[PDB]
Amino acid sequence: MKTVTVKNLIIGEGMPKIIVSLMGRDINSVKAEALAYREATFDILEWRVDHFMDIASTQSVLTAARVIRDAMPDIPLLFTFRSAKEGGEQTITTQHYLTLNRAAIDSGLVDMIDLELFTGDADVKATVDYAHAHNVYVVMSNHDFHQTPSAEEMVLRLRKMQALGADIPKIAVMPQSKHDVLTLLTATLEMQQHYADRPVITMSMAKEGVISRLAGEVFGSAATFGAVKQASAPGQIAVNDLRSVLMILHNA
Ligand SMILES: O=C(O)[C@@]1(O)C[C@@H](O)[C@H](O)[C@@H]2O[C@@H]21
């Protein structure tokens, strides 16, 4: 799709959309964070479910989703379990990971889910098709918190997500140099101009990669993450400062 419309939001045109991550270890924490987040300005709420420390209970997770909706009933909601090996707080079985995403989809509470590409092709393609049958969008994702792959590897990774039916391919990579930031910006622009028929989200993390979080309108990332009080990955800046920069670039 040229653009992904979610609620009142067009992803893939105009200024990149601003995502913040909500991180709560229990239901009381999730409630407090949701009430604090609704006094910040952003386009999409990501719920980082891997920070929730009663992950074994599917209904506990759904109860926490309902509290987020009690506080922010309408905001586009992205449900993300991030595995430890890709930057997250814990590891679950493949079966439970698919059960949590199926429950999220079935709840009617969530607009998008995050699926990690390296979960495995048959499992990812099934959850994509399930999401789509329930009018839920899929951000398919991959993360490297240690290094930056070649531009060719990043393009082919994003293309494989597209091939598996991802609405919005996403990749986050860690620069070890400033040249690595250019590699990520080059891959991004190759997707937007040539290899993608849908929006992509991309970022080079850490301080060196901050420009990648600001320059989406230029090089073709459709969304960008900011911090309300606490970053969910290195390089996220204050969401008001992020908004300031996006508006200056949009307006020249
Ligand atoms: O902004 C980043 O660098 C992230 O690692 C944060 C994640 O919470 C989020 O799901 C996006 O994977 C990106």
Short mmCIF file of all heavy atoms in Angstrom, two decimals, residues 15 35 60 83 92 108 130 175 242:
data_model
loop_
_atom_site.label_atom_id
_atom_site.label_comp_id
_atom_site.label_asym_id
_atom_site.label_seq_id
_atom_site.Cartn_x
_atom_site.Cartn_y
_atom_site.Cartn_z
N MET A 15 5.04 14.47 6.98
CA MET A 15 6.08 14.32 8.03
C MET A 15 6.05 12.88 8.54
O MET A 15 4.98 12.31 8.73
CB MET A 15 5.84 15.22 9.24
CG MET A 15 6.34 16.58 9.05
SD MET A 15 6.07 17.51 10.57
CE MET A 15 4.29 17.63 10.50
N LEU A 35 -1.30 7.23 31.74
CA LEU A 35 -1.87 8.54 32.15
C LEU A 35 -0.84 9.66 31.93
O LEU A 35 -1.23 10.79 31.67
CB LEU A 35 -2.38 8.43 33.61
CG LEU A 35 -3.58 7.51 33.78
CD1 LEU A 35 -3.95 7.32 35.24
CD2 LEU A 35 -4.81 8.00 33.01
N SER A 60 -3.67 -11.43 31.64
CA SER A 60 -2.97 -10.30 32.30
C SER A 60 -2.53 -9.27 31.25
O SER A 60 -2.74 -8.05 31.45
CB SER A 60 -1.79 -10.77 33.06
OG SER A 60 -2.22 -11.59 34.15
N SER A 83 11.94 -9.42 21.63
CA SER A 83 12.73 -10.54 22.23
C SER A 83 14.08 -10.00 22.74
O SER A 83 14.65 -9.09 22.12
CB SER A 83 12.93 -11.70 21.27
OG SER A 83 13.74 -11.34 20.19
N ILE A 92 10.43 -15.51 25.21
CA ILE A 92 9.29 -16.44 25.38
C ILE A 92 9.38 -17.51 24.28
O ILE A 92 10.10 -17.33 23.27
CB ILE A 92 7.93 -15.72 25.39
CG1 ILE A 92 7.68 -14.93 24.11
CG2 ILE A 92 7.76 -14.84 26.62
CD1 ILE A 92 6.42 -14.10 24.12
N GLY A 108 -9.50 -6.71 19.58
CA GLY A 108 -10.04 -5.47 19.00
C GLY A 108 -9.42 -4.20 19.58
O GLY A 108 -9.88 -3.09 19.30
N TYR A 130 -3.43 -13.78 9.49
CA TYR A 130 -4.40 -13.71 10.61
C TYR A 130 -4.70 -12.26 10.96
O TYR A 130 -5.84 -11.86 11.06
CB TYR A 130 -3.91 -14.55 11.77
CG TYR A 130 -4.94 -14.73 12.86
CD1 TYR A 130 -5.81 -15.80 12.82
CD2 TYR A 130 -5.11 -13.83 13.90
CE1 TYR A 130 -6.77 -15.99 13.80
CE2 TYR A 130 -6.06 -14.00 14.89
CZ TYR A 130 -6.95 -15.06 14.80
OH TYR A 130 -7.87 -15.26 15.79
N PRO A 175 25.12 1.78 14.68
CA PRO A 175 26.32 2.26 14.01
C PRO A 175 27.53 2.07 14.94
O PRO A 175 27.44 2.37 16.09
CB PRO A 175 26.00 3.73 13.72
CG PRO A 175 25.19 4.14 14.91
CD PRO A 175 24.33 2.91 15.19
N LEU A 242 12.10 16.21 18.97
CA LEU A 242 11.92 15.45 17.70
C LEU A 242 10.86 16.15 16.84
O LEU A 242 11.11 16.45 15.66
CB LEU A 242 11.51 14.02 18.06
CG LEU A 242 11.13 13.12 16.89
CD1 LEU A 242 12.25 13.04 15.88
CD2 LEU A 242 10.73 11.74 17.42
#
